[PDB]
Write a protein that binds this ligand. Sequence first.
Ligand SMILES: [Zn+2]
Length: 252
Amino acid sequence: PQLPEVETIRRTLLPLIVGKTIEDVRIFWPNIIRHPRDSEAFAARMIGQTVRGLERRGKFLKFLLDRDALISHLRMEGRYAVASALEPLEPHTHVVFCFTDGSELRYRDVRKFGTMHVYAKEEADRRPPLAELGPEPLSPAFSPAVLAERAVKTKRSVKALLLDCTVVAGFGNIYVDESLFRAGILPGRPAASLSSKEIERLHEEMVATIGEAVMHLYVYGRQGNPCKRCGTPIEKTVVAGRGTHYCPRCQR
DNA sequence: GGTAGATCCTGAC
DNA sequence: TCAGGACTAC
Ligand SMILES: [Zn+2]
């Protein structure tokens, strides 16, 4: 899931778990647990805590309990569901939080790429994976000025810059390619080669593209098909190690 | 320090 | 054979 989907999860999951008290935590793929490194310590500390809130930072979910916060990233295919402890688990369920009311919060992930970190609330923001996280793309903290500062200071491509979590929080591949197309900028351009006008325009399209989503694709996954704006075949290459889609006519 | 590289894991080739 | 987000060593 991408940022907009993660926000939808935050909104819809919260009422389904708020005020419930953890009675058990069951872990079927320990690699997912990143802190405490010992999955048994992870499970033990959460027991007896009540869910008080659920926040999002970038593509991370932050479950707020009594003492601790649980920081969760779903990566490509992770998913949460709330269901009865009386029913069989779905395939690829790797972590389960059991509540005193007989319901469960279940984490599934076919690829097993997702991560979980637990810390005392007051420490969560200054430890990985939240430490160093850039500003929310939809917040005043993410400004053309901030983007300009990072752009001028690097030798990397503009695509690499946008993919960097320290630059802006949770801006995914699909939105990078769509934003660059909408801003008329080739993904392979050196970030420092962008004019102030290009930076401004890119910031604007980033906010609009992801803003629209949180509430129709031009290039992403459209290789070999005609550009919706000029009819030129969309091309796909690799930029910053990622599948990268662009129109060689609309983007410069 | 900035930056590439390595890394996980398995469905779809 | 390999893409895909967010500690190590060049
Ligand atoms: Zn075009």
